[PDB]
Amino acid sequence: ASMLPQVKALYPYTAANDEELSFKVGDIITILEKDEGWWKGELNGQEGWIPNNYVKEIL
């Protein structure tokens, strides 16, 4: 398999529209794609863009 990046949320986020993904502090989110400040995440079957300042990539 290929490894995807994962990030851990440091702040909660409420999606502003249907292209974005909501999360809570400590959620582990899988990154499908990066576009500078917005990353595309997947969490429990939901997919959407997230602000990268809310999270920290797991090394």
UniProtKB/TrEMBL annotation:
Residue ranges annotated for the SH3 domain, each copy included: 4-58
Cellular compartments annotated: Cell projection, Pseudopodium; Cytoplasm, Cell cortex
Organism superkingdom: Eukaryota
Subunit note: Myosin I heavy chain is single-headed. Dimer of a heavy and a light chain. Inability to self-assemble into filaments.
Family: Belongs to the TRAFAC class myosin-kinesin ATPase superfamily. Myosin family.
Protein name in UniProt: Unconventional myosin IB
Species: Entamoeba histolytica (strain ATCC 30459 / HM-1:IMSS / ABRM)
